[PDB]
């Protein structure tokens with residue numbers, strides 16, 4: 001019961017926006033005043049994960065990698081291909097861009 | 100706006116209802132596969148919390164007015180939620196009704212009927228009396244057990260039924276119903292669209308219309324069974340009279356399937372039993388359920404889930420835990436589908452595994468529906484979609500395809516006729532009993548039968564409709580219906596009638612989809628994906644639509660049709676014509692011995 005999700009919200013989320021608010025969702029015309037009930041729902045509902053669920057309801061962990069480029073120098077640059085070194089022979093060399 | 104409030108209310112209700120229903124269903128599964136006091140009490144608070152949550156949400160759901168709701172799925176969900184049931188009463192009257200129901204259950208489960216001058220061999224029904232009705236051939240011992248169970252139930256259950264009728268009528272009229280039979284008939288009510296409108300008061304006349312032409316087939320079958328029982332009992336049964344109530348193979352005459360050794364056409368021809376072929380090839384319960392899954396993926400239904408194989412018990416565990424021998428398919432929620440079965444290596448358990456996997460596929464198909472619409476279209480659809488799989492699994496073609504029956508099998512007409520007669524004794528013989536019992540319950544709850552004219556009315560209609568006479572006269576101190584399990588535990592009985600009709604309707608629809616050019620009873624729906632798609636057009640619906648629309652989606656009709664039932668039994672009906680020329684088809688209401 002430690003995994004929650006938001007089921008009710010007044011307006012749709014903007015991209016890469018979070019909402020950690022626990023304000024009571026007013027679905028009607030009467031003011032909620034912080035107390036749940038009829039037409040007054042708590043927005044956070046629990047992902048009651050159990051190991052005997054079906055595959056469409058079993059918990060899935062998701063990591064979203066978002067890549068951005070800015071005017072700054074791009075300092076996240078992954079592995080570069082390297083081959084073995086051969087000496088005493090006329091070969092085409094390329095070290096750090098220098099060919 | 101009211102409809103958006105109802106949408107947000109249903110959105111808030113659905114997830115908590117799914118969670119609490121899963122907890123209640125998991126506690127019930129933990130009790131049913133592991134019987135102890137801790138699992139029983141865990142089931143008790145789980146069911147109490149789930150029922151209390153359902154009722155407190157239904158009180159809020161009754162505040163919505165359905166005259167300004169345009170979306171029919173939201174209106175159907177709010178119709179399903181607003182069924183309060185027995186909670187509409189006061190606390191005293193509800194406590195009295197629950198006390199009466201629970202003491203009926205505990206007096207039916209522990210009723211004991213035993214012998215003059217022999218008190219020591221004193222028997223419950225469940226180990227011994229069903230064996231006496233199924234096996235014994237002595238007339239006086241059956242008259243003993245029948246009259247004793249009628250006495251030792253009816254004398255104790257007549258006044259309990261007297262207040263039971265009044266309190267159930269008050270329960271129905273607190274929910275704006277005419278009577279408790281009308282409350283049961285409100286499960287068949289359909290309100291959506293135009294041309295799909297079905298009413299409660301229509302249902303009774305539809306049942307009578309569908310009983311108007313099963314009656315010649317039942318009359319011929321009754322005449323043949325009466326003649327074979329006259330061969331069995333020489334002078335105790337009249338040729339023109341009705342059958343005695345204690346010679347029908349059951350406690351009540353509900354199923355005639357125990358009369359098959361007595362009423363066999365051809366005793367020298369064996370049955371289509373393939374149990375010994377399973378024992379010779381070393382089959383177990385896992386291979387039975389894998390062959391059922393192979394059948395369902397051959398017809399086009401999806402595979403079984405991994406949690407189905409992981410969590411179901413398919414064998415007697417023998418680990419010291421008590422289990423219920425009754426097979427049951429469980430839809431626990433959140434994609435959890437299980438089967439509780441004590442599978443022996445038999446053909447009957449193979450067909451029962453196909454039946455419960457039909458239940459499992461029915462539960463799996465409407466999982467995409469909302470929680471309040473995850474039911475059958477009506478009460479007959481859920482068992483009909485298992486009975487069609489039980490029909491298709493028993494064919495000689497399916498057993499020859501999977502190697503259970505040899506390839507050089509010659510299926511002559513004699514074993515086909517006696518297979519069809521066994522199916523008729525199981526299937527056709529329960530229909531006048533079902534129509535009688537539900538007609539009597541509807542007339543008692545409506546008040547069409549006066550209170551002091553109960554028993555003699557009942558034995559009138561059994562002299563009239565079913566064609567079965569009482570062995571001894573009964574006065575109004577008896578309560579002769581109440582000896583049955585379904586009426587002493589508050590269960591609807593017309594679901595078996597609608598099951599029987601929808602079963603053969605679905606069977607003709609799936610065999611016309613599979614393009615089978617032979618007779619209906621030889622038809623196999625295996626290796627036919629278009630029949631599976633025609634089936635999944637209905638199974639994916641749930642009760643989101645009216646049941647007439649789902650019925651038109653399968654068979655192209657909007658009502659019950661028994662022409663498929665007479666077309667299934669057509670060679671047998673011709674055979675029953677061929678051996679009833681000299682006999683008298685029909686019965687006399689006057690008591691003939």
Ligand SMILES: *[C@@H]1O[C@H](CO)[C@@H](O)[C@H](O)[C@H]1NC(C)=O
Nearest residue numbers: 132133134135137138418420
């Ligand atoms: C059945 O219930 C008892 C109750 O304590 C428990 O000890 C046992 O482990 C249960 N069996 C299974 C298979 O879970």
Ligand SMILES: *[C@@H]1O[C@H](CO)[C@@H](O)[C@H](O)[C@H]1NC(C)=O
Nearest residue numbers: 397496500501623625626627
């Ligand atoms: C249906 O397909 C299965 C798949 O192996 C096959 O074994 C079976 O013989 C087929 N049935 C018919 C009637 O061809």
